[model samples]
Target: VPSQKTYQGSYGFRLGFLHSGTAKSVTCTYSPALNKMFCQLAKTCPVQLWVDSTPPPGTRVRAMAIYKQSQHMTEVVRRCPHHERCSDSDGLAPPQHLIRVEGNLRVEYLDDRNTFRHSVVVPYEPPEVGSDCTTIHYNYMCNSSCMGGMNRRPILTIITLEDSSGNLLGRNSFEVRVCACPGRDRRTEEENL
Candidate 1:
């Protein structure tokens, strides 16, 4: 098999193989967080297989142990899920507000198309008294909803706090306009003023 480039933190690998002249089965083995092996029976000589695994960042793909019965063979290995760092300052800033809540804070929002739900933790310094004012920071990714006809649509952000036992402590909701492009200037220009 030939080498390939893959993203970091992504799980899975691609396998390519060719068999010739009466190969019935092949077994493959690799180590990714753990040692694993796979064996399959094939009616023909040439074939390809994809094996998935969770590998940590900065892992190098190498040869896997292969075993076969009565045939000639070839193999290829590749890793995926490249990782990259992004700057948050470029996107339009969601309206910030302080709300009094207790326990752990959770923030949930939807993508511009309203097709996918995304959630993140809102970190705050625990208040000494009953409830403390927690500031919420929200950001939206650039998508079709922002670039096209739905640019004026309001995206809802739901904030909630849960106790250690998973009981709801408090909740709040707010709306912010999505952005067409992801950048500080684009966000500033779209501000409702």
Candidate 2:
């Protein structure tokens, strides 16, 4: 993400201004009566805005009067490039223990000779569950394009659960098949059939 500095105003607004020192030249200003913010720069710049408080239900606020630097001059006036309403509850929530996960894990790949192989592990999680706990999606994928034959390779998976306080809830292990590429004899048999 690009670096930006945030300025909070007393009148119920937050301004996110792009760092302008990288530009050739930059100037910024605000109009009290019009409740408008403006930026001027030698090159095109981006800006974002947020209102401190929610406005009337149907009110729609948007940028206006944007202009780019002219071919003849090094200055131009433009409206803020972007704006969004700030949410009161936008901060991160306290972390909690993951009770369980309920989804499949897929492993797919092709060997050096372009033979396809795959396997799946469904709804894997820690062995124990709390009476009040809930499950979350646990979708995961491991894929590759080229590898040597996976003859008798063991695909081991360990699932563990822990609370926010770092206390371990439970743990379990499971195994999935890792298929090997078809041998030349098998390929020849299939081709002849």
Candidate 3:
């Protein structure tokens, strides 16, 4: 991975049922500013899941994990009878987003069509016995998605976690969007309004 600027945020989702026997939930966050996903897998769950501050981590991705260009888009829009917008049940899957334009629609991609290609496999310092949790870093770039009008095309990022033994711990994903303006902007000038 190449060096890029970093950012901060407070939005996230809970994904996966890490371990079945001694299960743990993972907190997955999509930093719009960085166009990255930051997941915190903890033993305590910190604030308790109910506040939506955190939530139950299933072996699946929750509806809340899908971040969009519009901050106020609804859950029903995220989930629908329409198969195109909805993700599949498979543990390992890729997801894309769409938006309507004068009754027409199209798939969203960065101006250069570049995107994060892989998920990070952590452990310069492996997990110790009874260790609390680890923050999983997502691989993405600042220039991938940003600007106004077209600013909200978020990409769904999937995470598949494993243990040192190669055991499947669990997995989850996020709809990542760039919240910051990069070297320049790609948002259409007419759409700027």
- Residue by residue across 1-193, what tens digits does model 3's lDDT show? 1111111112232332232121122233333334343322111111111111222232211112323434533221221224333443222223222211111122112211343332223332222445534332232322123332223444444443333453444444444433333112222221344
Q: After superposition, how far is residue 147 of candidate 2 from its true place, in Å?
A: 2.1
TM-score of decoy 2 = 0.21
Query: For candidate 2, lDDT tens digit of each residue in 63-159?
Result: 1111111331221111112211212111221011001122222211111133111112122122134322222232211111112211223232233
**Model 1 per-residue lDDT tens digits across residues 1-193:** 1111232222322333222111222322111211111112111111122324333333222111111211211311011111012232222222111111122234322222342222334332322354322222222233214223222332333333433443333333323222222233222333433
Q: Which of 2 and 3 is the better model by lDDT?
A: 3
Q: Give TM per candidate.
A: 0.28, 0.21, 0.28
Q: Rank the candidates by lDDT, best first.
A: 3, 1, 2
lDDT, residue 167, model 3: 41
Compared with the true structure, model 3 gives a TM-score of 0.28
**lDDT value, candidate 2, whole model:** 0.24
* True-structure RMSD, every candidate: 25.5, 28.9, 17.4
Q: Evaluate all candidate structures by whole-model CA lDDT and list the values in order.
A: 0.25, 0.24, 0.28
